[model samples]
Target: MNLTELMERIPHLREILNIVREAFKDYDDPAHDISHTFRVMENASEIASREKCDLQKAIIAALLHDIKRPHEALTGVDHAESGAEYASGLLPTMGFDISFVAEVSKAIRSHRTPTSLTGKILQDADRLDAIGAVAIARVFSYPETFWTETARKMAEDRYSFVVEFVQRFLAEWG
Candidate 1:
């Protein structure tokens, strides 16, 4: 399905989309803004199409994966759990089947927990955005001192981090 169709079909699509969009509103860095969510959503959709699983669940989960992230403050509860709860509460009102709601919630919960196929796909898609040229720029953009130090100390550490992220997912999922 096209992006428009996919969004329209998903329960609470617009609301969830807005949640992610608004969550990143004050984000100064372009790399970790709503654009990143869009890319992850796009990648999730692509994988869902190939997997022939629940597209709606995948799309919705992807869009709101980071909904509760307070990047600037880096405070508050876990964003994954927050996003999952947000999706769960809002989905039923948007006409999602009860069973699918559970599935979607589970997917959202597991997305950052390091296991399950749905989680792995979502994690990989999000992680993919964390590498390569754009990722390099984003690393510099972050206010975190450790990231800057990692960049300066050993450039290879950046790549290693990505690899470790991937490996952690595989170890947990595979």
Candidate 2:
């Protein structure tokens, strides 16, 4: 289905999309934006279709996956946890069934940190965006904007972190 049809079917999904977009409004960084969210959603949708999971849940999870990210950066409040809470509050109002909401929330909660099968798919899709040539550019570009001088000095170490992240997390499949 097209994006319009997807949004039409999931009324509250747009609100979550708006939240993520507004949350990152001031972010001039190319790596993380609404566009990134859209790409991630596309990836998640592809995987979900292949796996026969609910497409709406996958879309909702993908859209709101980073909802609490801004607060996390400023206040040290784990975005995954905070985003899950945020989603929990808004999801029911958006008409998500309890089970589906739970699945979407859990997917968002574990997407970055690692957990379930659905979460793995979400994380893989997100990380897939971080591989190859684009990943290389984003790695440098992100540090260029967000990292301090001392942090930038540790670029090699930071690069190693990405390597380790892929090695540790991406190897899992089921």
Candidate 3:
């Protein structure tokens, strides 16, 4: 299902989508565009379903994950850290209780080097998108970082394809 259909199943997703859209409105990076956020949400949703995690929190973290990328580009800040704090501020305005906000913020904050299961899932989901049918440099070495067996299996498949593509491209270049 698309994001609109997902919003029906996940609470506050529509509002969060609006907020994320505005946050990313001026962003120009193609790789980290709004579409990237949607894809990450899709990844997180699938992983959460298999892992039996809190799907809403995972989805929220995915939606808000890179909302600060444009600012990070301008100021040389860490988007994950800044986005966590940014989500902390935004969640309260949307009627999310303090604990709920905390959970989402923590997941966002630790997505790079995750400390909790939820954070790990977010990291895996983000990295899953990075490695599948596309690319990101550091994620190539993150074979151990994928949280669930489901994610790992998915990564194995996706990473192999990326490796094959790179090898073929290099062969042609030479």
lDDT tens digits, residues 66-119, model 1? 776664347767777877787788788878889777766776776655445566
TM-score per candidate, in order?
Answer: 0.66, 0.70, 0.84
lDDT at residue 9 of model 2 (Cα atoms): 72
In model 1, where is the ten-residue run with the lowest total lDDT?
Answer: 143-152
User: Lowest summed lDDT over 10 consecutive residues: which window, candidate 2?
Assistant: 145-154
Q: Residues 1-174, candidate 3, lDDT per residue (tens digit)?
A: 677778788878888888889988878677677888888888889888888988888899999988888888889999989999999998898788898889889989887667667788888889887676645544452466677887998888888888888899799999
Residue 142's C-alpha lDDT in candidate 2?
A: 72
lDDT of each: 0.66, 0.68, 0.84
Cα error of candidate 2 at position 104, Å: 1.4
Q: Write the per-residue lDDT of candidate 2 for residues 84-149, one digit (tens) a residue.
A: 888888888867789877877787888765555566566655655554445666766773421123
What is the model-wide C-alpha lDDT for candidate 1?
0.66
Top model number, TM-score: 3
* Candidate 3 lDDT for residue 76: 96
Winner on lDDT between 1 and 2 is 2
User: What TM-score does candidate 1 reach?
Assistant: 0.66
Model 2: what TM-score?
Answer: 0.70
